[model samples]
Target chain A: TTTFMDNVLGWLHKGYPEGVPPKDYFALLALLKRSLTEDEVVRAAQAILRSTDGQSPVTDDDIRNAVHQIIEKEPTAEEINQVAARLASVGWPLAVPV
Target chain B: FMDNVLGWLHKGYPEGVPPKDYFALLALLKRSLTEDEVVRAAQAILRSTDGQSPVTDDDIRNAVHQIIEKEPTAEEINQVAARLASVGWPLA
Candidate 1:
């Protein structure tokens, strides 16, 4: 099951074989912040959201686990934060250790 | 070739979905610039844009003609306009 994040990561890998530069890093983050239309990532996010109401804080591990479970790949801090930020915007709990 | 430009434009449009003309214009530019130069032209367009106002086909036409030094076909311009119109971007 190929996820959107997989494709995004793949594009990044292909586009930046030499590694993403500092200037392009923020640009890439901007790209990731956009409303993702892909169902896999959306569903994975929703699953996490449903597991907890806004009361409990969502941890970094929580995001890491969900991303790994869904896509079978460990998400980097930025990737996790990307997901966290979008989730937070829609009333999800804070991304912090509880 | 396609993914190269798609990657750049994906970064260029911070607002979730880029206007449909963006897809068309980038595709047109793909047929039109070297890989590195494609990013240059895309960055040029992105730098000029505020992501608020509609990006008309004329804007793309002028950019290609003046910035990239290519003569865009009437059909190509119309195709971009059609795509922009499809997304409710005002044509007038």
Candidate 2:
């Protein structure tokens, strides 16, 4: 069981510097933000995660859109940056705007 | 601690079963766990697999029943509705 968690976290950590999830998957931090937290701040991060690119979960846009989504939302650029900090608190470091 | 267990499921489930079958798993979870525990347990079950191991759905159900150490009430069906809601599923 610990191996399962370790493997999943390992995948997430690999993409931390990229901030972009691998092709065909949502951003790791974004998915964690939504699935774990009930906050809109976190939800905003979740909302950023890709979703089969307008396809279904059974499964969007280019990276530019994801990068700009934080700018579009009310959460200040720093707040979004803080999202990564919070993740790092738990040992998942994700520096945004990467 | 429980959150850590469920948290891996957010890893995008590249190893997850199909969505259609995932629904049935949710149903089984609803039956096994009374309310929010289903969400908690379902998340753990998904985390239990490594995509290499042959842990089947039967393993999932068996694990949930064994790990939780809970008692199912007489109104088992009554408990399902609320349980599904926790995971954001409605009677659709």
Candidate 3:
């Protein structure tokens, strides 16, 4: 009988025909377990922000601003909240949620 | 031990030709394993194996569950098994 983990693994394989890279590999496993944890999100944001721009100590506003410039669209409130919360852990300006 | 395995992985692919299952195994190693849990499981499985008998799917499942705290999927087991097979490990 096929299992949930089996199904998830199938999905992962289908998504990455070549292979899952280290970044996506770690995050995807975390996601499969459940939603992304604070630490997981934080780690992703750090890597993403670092890889993209020279900007350090970035804030949610900075991310939103960049997204707008890049995608010609606005960031969602949910996205902002999640990113803000994660960035906050690394000493970004916004206060974390209760 | 983990470092050794990782180094071995790189060394095995010196020409940059990774095995078909290399990336998948790499991900699992990065996710759950020093020679980490995978090496431990692989070692334990190999030690008990007679070397002639075909390693079954169940064998991989049992080893992963016993050695890894995080449960891996069937495809993960397949990836591990395939890599072992590539190195001349027998499988049923």
Largest DockQ belongs to which candidate?
Answer: 3
The digit string of per-residue lDDT tens for model 1 on B24-59 reads 433443243445544444445556866568776568
Worst lDDT 10-window in candidate 1 chain A: A1-10
lDDT of 3 at A14: 68
How many pairs of residues collide in each model?
0, 1, 2
Off by over 4 Å in 2: A1-98, B1-32, B52-55, B70-92
- Give the TM-score ranking, best first: 1, 3, 2
Alpha carbon deviation, residue A37, candidate 3 (Å)? 30
Using Cα atoms, each model's DockQ against the true complex is 0.05, 0.02, 0.06
For model 2, residues B1-92, the per-residue Cα lDDT tens digits are: 12322333334344543433333322332243545666655556446644454444344445455656653321232233334345554332
Candidate with the larger lDDT of 2 and 3: 3
TM-score of chain B of each: 0.39, 0.31, 0.54
> How does residue B44 of candidate 2 score in lDDT?
60
Q: What share of the true interface contacts does each candidate keep?
A: 0.00, 0.00, 0.00
Model 3 per-residue lDDT tens digits across residues A1-98: 12323444565566676665554543544444333446545654665556554335455556556444443455443444566666655664443241
Interface CA RMSD, all predictions: 12.2, 11.2, 6.7
lDDT of each: 0.55, 0.39, 0.54
| Candidate 3 global TM-score | 0.32
